[PDB]
Amino acid sequence: SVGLIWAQSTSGVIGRDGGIPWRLPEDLAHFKRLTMGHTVVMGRRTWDSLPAAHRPLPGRRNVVVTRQTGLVAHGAQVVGSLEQALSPAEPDAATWVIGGAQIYALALPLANRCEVTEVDVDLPPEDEDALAPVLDQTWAGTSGEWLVSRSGLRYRMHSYRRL
Ligand SMILES: NC(=O)c1ccc[n+]([C@@H]2O[C@H](COP(=O)([O-])OP(=O)(O)OC[C@H]3O[C@@H](n4cnc5c(N)ncnc54)[C@H](OP(=O)(O)O)[C@@H]3O)[C@@H](O)[C@H]2O)c1
Ligand SMILES: Nc1nc(N)c(OCCCOc2ccccc2CCC(=O)O)c(-c2ccccc2)n1
Numbered sequence: 219s220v221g222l223i224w225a226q227s228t229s230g231v232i233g234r235d236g237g238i239p240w241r242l243p244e245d246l247a248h249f250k251r252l253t254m255g256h257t258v259v260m261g262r263r264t265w266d267s268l269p270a271a272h273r274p275l276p277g278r279r280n281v282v283v284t285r286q287t288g289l290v291a292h293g294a295q296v297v298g299s300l301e302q303a304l305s306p307a308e309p310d311a312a313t314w315v316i317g318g319a320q321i322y323a324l325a326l327p328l329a330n331r332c333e334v335t336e337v338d339v340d341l342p343p344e345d346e347d348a349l350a351p352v353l354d355q356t357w358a359g360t361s362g363e364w365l366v367s368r369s370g371l372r373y374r375m376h377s378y379r380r381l
Pocket of ligand 2: 223224225238242245246248249250264267268269272275276315316317333334335
């Protein structure tokens with residue numbers, strides 16, 4: 219079972235300047251809860267974006283997709299394609315694709331679940347932004363209520379599954 223998990227602004231931004239352009243602690247906690255103990259598959263640019271105490275993501279099998287065969291990624295398994303990432307020698311009940319924009323587009327046709335955090339932050343898109351994938355009519359979802367973070371941002375969680 220392959221799931222995608224991401225956080226986006228309402229406008230569809232997920233990344234800017236090599237990081238994430240808002241602070242939402244409740245969403246980081248959501249991400250940690252859902253992924254702990256499982257495999258997390260990410261693009262190389264997302265691996266480079268992880269802060270020191272989170273690179274590798276503790277308690278999870280980190281898998282990094284790159285075309286650079288020789289890449290040094292201490293604490294992670296380097297593979298050369300998304301399909302490789304999803305064909306482990308040691309199966310996992312739950313595999314999560316955790317970004318970024320390039321990898322989400324490759325993974326979406328292979329996935330059966332998307333766990334999306336929506337962040338009510340006004341972020342008009344900028345030219346180098348990474349953007350969220352779009353879910354079409356093959357996906358159907360349920361939305362949690364709009365919540366307010368202790369830090370101030372409105373947010374809510376959506377759970378989609380392939381029809
Ligand atoms: N808000 C969220 O939920 C969230 C989650 C994750 C990331 N982000 C943000 O999103 C941004 C990063 O996303 P991104 O789209 O720039 O990059 P990305 O998808 O993390 O990584 C792209 C890299 O993946 C590798 N790759 C892509 N397609 C491949 C293929 N077919 N075969 C093999 N390798 C392939 C390449 O690595 P090589 O160049 O090494 O070959 C490429 O440069 C950052 O801003 C990050 O902070 C946000
Ligand atoms: N919903 C949802 N899906 C995602 N795929 C996602 O990004 C995961 C990759 C970046 O992870 C980061 C980035 C910076 C700091 C810490 C971590 C991992 C910490 C840890 O779990 O140990 C996030 C997210 C995570 C953190 C901040 C904002 C959004 N949120």
